């Protein structure tokens, strides 16, 4: 908590993401799958809503799905099962 406000890409601190997941590769797959779901929801939103759910946190003006997903992970809003 001694750090200052992170800038840009490192806005969600990497360590705070690490303690919520098993390992770095698991975190990467976490973020990738969530970004895939969010992008699918964004593309398909015009038609009937499918099982995919949009961003749980409030998206920014023009925010990347990957960063939105990482913010969701930091907020502790999703759960995963490993292989």
């Amino acid at each position: 908590g001694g750090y200052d406000t992170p800038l840009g890409i490192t806005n969600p601190p990497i360590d705070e993401l690490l303690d919520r997941v098993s390992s770095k590769y698991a975190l990467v797959i976490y973020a990738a799958k969530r970004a895939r779901q969010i992008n699918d929801y964004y593309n398909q939103l015009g038609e009937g809503i499918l099982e995919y759910v949009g961003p749980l946190v409030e998206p920014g003006l023009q925010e990347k799905p990957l960063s939105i997903a990482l913010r969701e992970i930091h907020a502790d809003l999703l759960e995963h099962t490993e292989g």
Partner: protein
């Protein structure tokens, strides 16, 4: 370099060439140089320069590039150079004369047309959509395909002159070619960050940052320094000769006079005559091995007659007090300043910047081409693959190998997804692997793939 009435003897220089001044080779310019570090913009062999070098055109070069295109007879007839290009706008033809060649002196930029040449293509397989477009816009036959000469992507400039060759005018050409046109394009390239400057002692360096003239160190007289080099590169590389040259250049620029009130000093005893008194901005020659001694140069630095008023900016040991151009406080310790010969090398960033999103591909294997002649494509080699594997990131390696290089359907689908907004699709089988499989099969080797 001569006048209208002066006499000239045999062997005298009459006109100077590209890198010659008054008949002697001059590959660079004399710049006022300080050799202290500055804010890290000169960190690790980087070089800092004033904006007055950009302004006064101190370091500018004329670069002329030629472009060639020829009209040659083909099985379908003879391609012709003409300003009548089918299905093109009218504004783009403004710089083309009635001959179809860009007018001399017309400024040109990337993507423009230099020579208007069209070839007889007749017709090919027209898709139903193309037929509909032709028949709805009421286009005429548009019987020819315009393979006109366009400027290469990444440069611009003015047009100097045009040479036109045609076999109808007795001009000899290679067999099959009835017209040849070459267009000369020149750019007055200015100094910029990324360009490579160098000295005469192997102290090369790129330009980290071009500073405003106000925000640079300046002596007590107010003259800003023209170039700043880091001080950590000199002692490590053992090129003290550059500092010796800097001191001697400052001495020559300032001028000197040895006070022979009571005989010449001991260090100047063996110093040749006509060297005891030099006017400001004088030129001196130092032979490589019978050069100026350290004691002689120290004495010359000692006698360093003032510039305009009574003021000796440079002290006995060749240093001076500099005022910081940003904070304004005087620098705590004197730093060495002088005049150094700096040359601009032929490593301009304009000739090295390259980028590619999607271009041509090779025939045998579908990998992208290489080099700035084509559209390029970076070489992701075995060492890069090893680093990718060491990082543990498999998806990026799979993408760099499959859908960016070889998989044709992968490339098409990834472009379609990236334009339509959907996520990137799954990579497929690279074409190079299939090529290798067929090559192995051609060697009478029964190689196959088993799914279970």
């Amino acid at each position: 370099i001569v006048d209208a009435g002066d006499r000239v003897e045999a062997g005298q220089v009459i006109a100077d060439g590209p890198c010659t001044d008054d008949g002697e080779m001059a590959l660079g310019k004399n710049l006022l140089v300080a050799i202290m570090p500055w804010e890290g913009h000169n960190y690790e062999d980087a070089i800092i320069l004033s904006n007055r070098l950009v302004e006064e055109d101190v370091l500018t070069s004329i670069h002329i590039e030629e472009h060639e295109i020829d009209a040659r007879d083909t099985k379908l007839g003879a391609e012709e150079i003409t300003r009548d290009i089918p299905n093109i706008s009218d504004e783009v033809l403004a710089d083309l004369d009635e001959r179809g060649i860009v007018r001399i002196g017309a400024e040109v930029r990337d993507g423009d047309i230099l020579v208007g040449k069209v070839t007889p293509k007749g017709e090919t397989e027209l898709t139903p959509e193309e037929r509909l477009l032709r028949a709805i816009f009421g286009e005429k036959a548009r019987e020819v395909r315009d393979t006109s000469l366009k400027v290469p992507h990444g440069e611009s400039g003015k047009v100097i002159g045009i040479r036109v060759f045609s076999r109808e005018d007795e001009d000899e050409l290679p067999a099959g070619v009835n017209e040849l046109v070459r267009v000369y394009v020149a750019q007055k390239r200015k100094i910029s960050d990324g360009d490579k400057l160098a000295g005469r002692h192997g102290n090369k360096g790129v330009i980290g940052k071009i500073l405003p003239v106000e925000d640079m160190p300046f002596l007590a007289d107010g003259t800003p320094v023209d170039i700043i080099l880091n001080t950590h590169g000199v002692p490590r590389r053992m090129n003290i000769g550059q500092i010796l040259e800097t001191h001697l250049g400052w001495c020559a620029h300032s001028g000197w006079k040895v006070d022979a009130a009571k005989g010449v000093p001991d260090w100047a005893a063996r110093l040749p005559d006509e060297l005891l008194e030099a006017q400001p901005n004088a030129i001196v020659s130092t032979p490589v091995f019978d050069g100026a001694q350290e004691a002689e140069l120290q004495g010359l630095l000692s006698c360093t007659l003032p510039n305009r008023d009574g003021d000796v900016l440079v002290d006995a040991d060749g240093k001076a007090m500099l005022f910081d151009g940003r904070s304004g406080e005087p620098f705590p310790y004197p730093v060495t300043v002088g005049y150094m010969y700096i040359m601009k090398l032929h490593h301009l960033v304009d000739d090295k910047i390259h980028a590619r999103s999607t271009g041509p591909y090779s025939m045998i294997t579908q990998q992208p081409l290489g080099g700035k002649a084509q559209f390029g494509g970076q070489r992701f080699g075995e060492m890069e693959c090893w680093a990718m594997q060491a990082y543990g990131a498999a998806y990026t390696l799979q993408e760099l190998l499959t859908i960016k290089s070889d998989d044709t359907v992968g490339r098409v689908k990834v472009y379609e997804a990236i334009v339509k907004g959907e996520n990137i699709p799954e990579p497929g089988i690279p074409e190079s692997f299939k090529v290798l499989l067929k090559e192995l099969q051609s060697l009478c080797l029964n190689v196959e793939v088993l799914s279970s």
